[PDB]
Amino acid sequence: KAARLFIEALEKGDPELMRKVISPDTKMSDNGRLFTGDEVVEYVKEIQKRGEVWKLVSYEKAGNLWLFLVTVKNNGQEEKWAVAIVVRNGRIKEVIIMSI
Amino acid sequence: KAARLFIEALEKGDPELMRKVISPDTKMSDNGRLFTGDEVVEYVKEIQKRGEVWKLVSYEKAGNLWLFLVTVKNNGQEEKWAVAIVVRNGRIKEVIIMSI
Numbered sequence: 001k002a003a004r005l006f007i008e009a010l011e012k013g014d015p016e017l018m019r020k021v022i023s024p025d026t027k028m029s030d031n032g033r034l035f036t037g038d039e040v041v042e043y044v045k046e047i048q049k050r051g052e053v054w055k056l057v058s059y060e061k062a063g064n065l066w067l068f069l070v071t072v073k074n075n076g077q078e079e080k081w082a083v084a085i086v087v088r089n090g091r092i093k094e095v096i097i098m099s100i
Numbered sequence: 101k102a103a104r105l106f107i108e109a110l111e112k113g114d115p116e117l118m119r120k121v122i123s124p125d126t127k128m129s130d131n132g133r134l135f136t137g138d139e140v141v142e143y144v145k146e147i148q149k150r151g152e153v154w155k156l157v158s159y160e161k162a163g164n165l166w167l168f169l170v171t172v173k174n175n176g177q178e179e180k181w182a183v184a185i186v187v188r189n190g191r192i193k194e195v196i197i198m199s200i
């Protein structure tokens with residue numbers, strides 16, 4: 001459930017949805033930039049502010065680890081990103097977003 | 101340490117190195133194919149048997165989560181793959197290998 005909500009929050013640029021699956025100790029690396037806790041919710045506000053369109057293309061899963069391939073669109077420009085998450089107790093604990 | 105050994109085992113096609121950082125409950129998904137425990141060591145034997153050349157290009161990290169971008173070469177053919185790992189207690193617990 002948490003994993004689906006994570007994707008929907010990005011795809012819809014919905015910070016309040018992302019708040020539901022984040023914890024204060026959620027750790028995220030966005031291409032080397034570190035964000036913790038509510039900073040992850042702010043990351044999503046920035047998606048919405050910019051008008052970024054995220055689309056899930058495909059994913060795999062092993063236990064509590066998920067790996068997503070997504071495209072991000074911004075100003076007629078489409079690019080591929082890999083997004084890795086660890087889920088525990090209905091919360092996203094760690095997140096990595098990396099440019100391909 | 102475990103994370104570096106994981107990469108070196110792939111890059112060098114060394115099953116015995118991979119044995120050092122795997123546990124019996126290590127779970128791996130290789131593009132939807134599930135491997136557990138010693139099956140991960142056998143995955144590396146298959147790399148070496150085939151003559152596959154893996155090269156780490158870049159990586160990021162958030163807590164115990166690592167995400168690697170690697171190229172794999174095989175028969176004059178080079179392709180990009182994303183490799184996500186979770187490390188705990190010096191062991192790889194979960195692994196995902198996904199084609200880009």
Ligand SMILES: [Zn+2]
Nearest residue numbers: 011055056057
């Ligand atoms: Zn979608």
Ligand SMILES: [Zn+2]
Nearest residue numbers: 111155156157
């Ligand atoms: Zn290397």
